[PDB]
Amino acid sequence: DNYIYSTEVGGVGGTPFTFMQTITSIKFNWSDQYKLLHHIEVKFINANIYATGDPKGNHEVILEIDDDETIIGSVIGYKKGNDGRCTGVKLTTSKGKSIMAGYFEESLITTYTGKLAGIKGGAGSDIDRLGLIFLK
Amino acid sequence: DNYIYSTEVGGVGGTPFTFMQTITSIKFNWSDQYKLLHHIEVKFINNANIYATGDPKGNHEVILEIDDDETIIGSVIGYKKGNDGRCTGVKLTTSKGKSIMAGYFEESLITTYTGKLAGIKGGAGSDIDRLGLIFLK
Amino acid sequence: STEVGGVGGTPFTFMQTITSIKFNWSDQYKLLHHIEVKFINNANIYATGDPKGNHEVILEIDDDETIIGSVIGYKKGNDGRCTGVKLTTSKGKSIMAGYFEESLITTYTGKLAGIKGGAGSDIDRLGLIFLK
Amino acid sequence: DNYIYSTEVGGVGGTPFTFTSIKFNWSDQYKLLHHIEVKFINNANIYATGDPKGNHEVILEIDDDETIIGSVIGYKKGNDGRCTGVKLTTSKGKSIMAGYFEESLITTYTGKLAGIKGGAGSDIDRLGLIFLK
Amino acid sequence: DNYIYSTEVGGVGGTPFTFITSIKFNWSDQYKLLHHIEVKFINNANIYATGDPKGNHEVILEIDDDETIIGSVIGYKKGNDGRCTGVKLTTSKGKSIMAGYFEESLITTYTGKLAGIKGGAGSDIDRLGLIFLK
Amino acid sequence: NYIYSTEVGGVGGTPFTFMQETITSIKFNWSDQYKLLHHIEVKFINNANIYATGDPKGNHEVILEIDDDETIIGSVIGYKKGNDGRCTGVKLTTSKGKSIMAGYFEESLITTYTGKLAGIKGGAGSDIDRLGLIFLK
Amino acid sequence: DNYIYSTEVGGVGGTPFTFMQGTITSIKFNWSDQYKLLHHIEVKFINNANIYATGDPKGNHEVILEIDDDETIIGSVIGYKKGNDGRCTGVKLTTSKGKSIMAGYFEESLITTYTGKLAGIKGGAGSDIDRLGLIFLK
């Protein structure tokens, strides 16, 4: 209520997370071996790293977000089903910044857009499930 | 009406549906095995209900979330024509450069009316037999 | 617009602006075979020709949407036939029907108001009609 | 005049001519223009010239307020020359392409297409466009 | 004087020249050079030609009264024994021509209202420069 | 005043911090043999001094000169993650269409904050172990 | 000064040059496919008929960029080999009127220079262009 919840995509498994009250940094860890996201970290506008998942993947990417910078384009790749996983994230900002993490070989959601305020989902070894959260 | 009805394309078969109350989420399920749409889900502004139809047996899906102020500016449905017909693909593009592509387009096409996507309508069984979009004015 | 194609088939003229148009065509004959049209504030399907072709395309036109680009492919001569239509709208919508292996007209442009021509088995001849 | 006369390109042969719609006839067999027709604003007459023996034609209809912004004629140069192709593009993104461009080219003046001029027999020997000012 | 002279590019050979609403270039596939140029001027029906028009191709660019050159490249062989091999021009109205070849040297010239040409030719165009307003 | 981008790469090498209370020249040295940054130099407005760090043993370098009024609008650092990590590449693009590419991007990336490039900070030995940029506000 | 001095890139060798006066109105670059270096540069200036050359024009390629009086450089890259032993290997320039040249090669080091009205050059040349810097104005 005064936040927009994007559909969490991927499986029912892993341990729940919800990170909120905006985002100033987000990092994604992924593997070439499993072609999944494994681990996410978030910082806020608050010096603590809010992490989740196991950072066992051979790649990472970080997007730093200026205070006034919104997300204008966002795609999450995922395997659908109870047994599902998140496999990739593309984001593009109101300033022409973009990141690409992991793979997009199965299902996609083109999310809502706005000021990236938090994330929510389940993670174990892998990121089972991810949803973004925006302002209003 | 207060609504613009796109021609429903595909076959006469399956069970009829109409979803209305604007659309804030839509998902399309499709198969590489059958090369059809099989299942559609829709959510609406200020209403937590998932309105589904068809059998979600396909190996792929795509979800488009629509911002409150976001209109559809380009829309194409692929389909097999005739009574025995099926809807095979959807491309949509929004007023914010968001776009989805579901399934296949190697037979017939409709380039639909455009505006604020308000509902869908059609028939579905195992497959999406027939699909029409509905827009505001 | 100049009606292009042959002298044959049965004449048609559809008028009242156009809100929907459909084209049927074949890979076997590489012609248009059949056209349908709907009009604003009128639920009637005005058809013509034999819809025996394996493909069709439908373009829906918003009330305020004009045609900005239009090409008809055709075989010229008395025994001629209309073979293809490309249309592009003032809102980036476009359709492509059938084939363009012989002759072409780039038509006048504006609000698509009607069509006119002759059709039997095939669309023998087609011309568009525009506004003010 | 109060007109711009583009250089007529192609040969000296055929019979001279000087004239909202234009049509070009051409052949895959000879790779030339053979025949042109022109219709005028507020005048229902077809002004033709040349022999329409070619297997292709194209028609460009020009809206009243529509100018030509890009124009190329392909031709064989010399007394024995022939006009072989026309590309035209309008102020509304309409374009036609007639026949072939395997030898010489002129990029013509541009504006409101007012007439044509040239010589034609079996083939279009020679063609020039005429624009306003 | 009240003219801007682009560098004449190509060789020392051929006969010197000095001469816009029309320009034509003749060239050969056999020699890959310009061989001959013609020019017409506003309010003057004369063809000002130079060089031997023995090449199998030509192109003509007509320039509207108010139309300037906004991009211009001349291809040439450098050195005393040099030759001018090509011209690309683009106008303030999106017209463009391409004449001949560009497989050795290039100059990107000054831009403006194309006012004249200058340079030496015989069988081939040995050397060419454009001239603009000031 | 200043905005500190996350320093990416390893914990190793000797710490550095360059600022002058903005950057007008920056140079990056890298190797095809090690596929790392090895050395960085920075000059500042109204100060002739070269502030270097790292061992310039690499076979390539690039220099970006920044006009006084010119901001960075796009910036990516490639790096190997982990304690034994290294910085491997820098792409920068300016408010005047100027851009450099230094070294390699075969592992991890940060798309940094943007603004008037004011300083750098990190650790370097043989290699640039770790790099963060610093901007105004 | 009234002038902006780009870093001179390339080697210490060759004979020094400095070309300045109005601003640059023509510049030419000679280069070789055999050595993949610049070998020779010429410059002309506004209101001055003098051809200011330097280096040995032994290379199989050249390009000339003419600069209109009011035309600035908006993009500029010099390729070079770094070190005392070094040489300048290429120049890309792009103007405020969509003109561009590309001379020689960019297989080793690059500088993306300051931009503005190209007023002069400076460097060292022998057989090859050893070293080049551009000079601009505020």
> DSSP letter string over B6-59?
PPPEE-S-SEEEEE---EEEEEEEE-TTT-SEEEEEEEETTEEEEEEEE---SS
Distance between CA atoms of residues G40 and G24, nearest Å: 17
Mutation site, D104, D130, D131, interface E, largest E CB count within 10 A: D104
Q: Do chains F and D touch (3 or more CB pairs under 8 A)?
A: no
Least CA distance to A73: which residue of chain B?
B98
Q: Beta strand pairing status for A127-135 and F108-111?
A: unpaired
User: Residue ranges of the alpha helices (H) in E27-127?
Assistant: none
Distance between CA atoms of residues A55 and F88, nearest Å: 21
| Contact status, residue A119 vs residue A7, Cβ threshold 8 Å | no
CB spacing of C60 vs B108 below 8 angstroms:
no
Tokens 């976001």 correspond to B70
Closest CA to B87 of B113, B48, B121, B44: B121
Q: What is the rounded end-to-end Cα distance, in angstroms, of chain D?
A: 9
Distances (CA, A) of C94 to C68, C85, C89, C112: 10, 10, 6, 14
Distances (CA, A) of A50 to A21, A23, A34, D51: 12, 11, 24, 82
How many Cβ atoms are within 10 Å of E103's Cβ, its own excluded? 10
How many Cβ atoms are within 10 Å of E40's Cβ, its own excluded? 19
Which residues is F74 bridged to in the sheet? F93
Distance between CA atoms of residues F85 and F1, nearest Å: 29
Distance between CA atoms of residues D47 and G103, nearest Å: 55
User: Does any CB of chain F come closer than 8 Å to the CB of residue A64?
Assistant: yes
Distance between CA atoms of residues C38 and C48, nearest Å: 12
Tokens for E133, please give them. Answer: 């307003």
Question: Dihedral sign, CA of A77, A79, A80, A82?
Answer: negative
Tokens for F30, please give them. Answer: 């890298």
| Contact status, residue A114 vs residue B96, Cβ threshold 8 Å | no
Could you say which of G6, G9, G112 has the minimum Cβ distance to residue F99?
G112
* Helix or strand run (H / E) with residue G31: strand G24-31
CA–CA–CA angle G132, G136, G138 (5° rounding): 160
User: Does any CB of chain A come closer than 8 Å to the CB of residue F88?
Assistant: no
User: Does any CB of chain D come closer than 8 Å to the CB of residue C69?
Assistant: yes
| Contact status, residue A62 vs residue F111, Cβ threshold 8 Å | yes
The 3 state secondary structure assigned to chain D is CCEEECCCEECCCCEEEECCEEEEEECCCCCCEEEEEEEECCEEEEEEEECCCCCEEEEEECCCCCCEEEEEEEEECCCCCEEEEEEEEECCCCEEEEECCCCEEEECCCECEEEEEEEECCCEEEEEEEEEC
F42-50 long-range contacts, CB within 8 A, separation 24+: F42/F18, F42/F119, F42/F120, F44/F18, F44/F20, F45/F20, F47/F20
Domains of chain E (ranges; CATH) run 4-132 (2.100.10.30)
Tokens 């950057």 correspond to F23
Tokens 């290699």 correspond to F127
| Contact status, residue G135 vs residue G3, Cβ threshold 8 Å | yes
* DSSP single-letter state for residue B127: S
Task: Provide CB contacts within 8 A for G137, sequence distance 6+.
Answer: G2, G3, G4, G23, G116, G117, G119
Nearest-Å Rg of the Cα atoms of chain A is 13
Least CA distance to B26: which residue of chain A?
A109
Mutation site, A110, A115, A135, interface B, largest B CB count within 10 A: A110
Instruction: Find the farthest-apart pair of alpha carbons in chain D and give their distance in angstroms, rounded.
Output: 39
Q: Which residues of D32-70 are buried (b: 16+ CB within 10 A; e: fewer)?
A: bbbbbbbbeeeeeeebbbbebebbbbbbbbbeeebebbb
Distance between CA atoms of residues A90 and A73, nearest Å: 8
Q: What is the dihedral of CA E5, E6, E9, E12, to 10 degrees?
A: 10
Tokens 């190997």 correspond to F80
Distance between CA atoms of residues G21 and E18, nearest Å: 30
Q: Is D47 left (phi over 0), alpha (psi -120 to 50) or beta?
A: beta
User: Does any CB of chain D come closer than 8 Å to the CB of residue C90?
Assistant: no
Could you say which of C68, C69, C108 has the minimum Cβ distance to residue D61?
C108
Distance between CA atoms of residues C91 and C71, nearest Å: 17
Which residues is F86 bridged to in the sheet? F80
Q: Beta strand pairing status for G109-112 and F60-65?
A: parallel
Distance between CA atoms of residues G111 and F27, nearest Å: 9
F39-48 long-range contacts, CB within 8 A, separation 24+: F39/F124, F39/F128, F40/F120, F40/F124, F40/F128, F40/F131, F42/F18, F42/F119, F42/F120, F44/F18, F44/F20, F45/F20, F47/F20
Task: Report the structure determination method.
Answer: X-ray
Could you say which of G63, G67, G98 has the minimum Cβ distance to residue E106?
G63
Cβ-based contacts of G70 with chain E (< 8 Å): none
**Burial class of residue F67 in the structure, from the number of CB atoms within 10 Å of its CB (0-12 exposed, 13-18 middle, 19+ buried):** middle
* DSSP single-letter state for residue F69: T
Distance between CA atoms of residues A115 and A93, nearest Å: 9
Nearest-Å Rg of the Cα atoms of chain G is 14
Closest CA to A111 of A78, A85, A73, A57: A73
Cβ-based contacts of E88 with chain D (< 8 Å): none
* Helix or strand run (H / E) with residue F11: none
Distance between CA atoms of residues F95 and G74, nearest Å: 12
Resolution (A): 2.6
Single-letter amino acid, residue F22: T
How many Cβ atoms are within 10 Å of C50's Cβ, its own excluded? 14
| 3-state DSSP assignment of residue A22 | coil
Tokens for D103, please give them. Answer: 């030898």
Could you say which of B65, B97, B99 has the minimum Cβ distance to residue A109?
B65
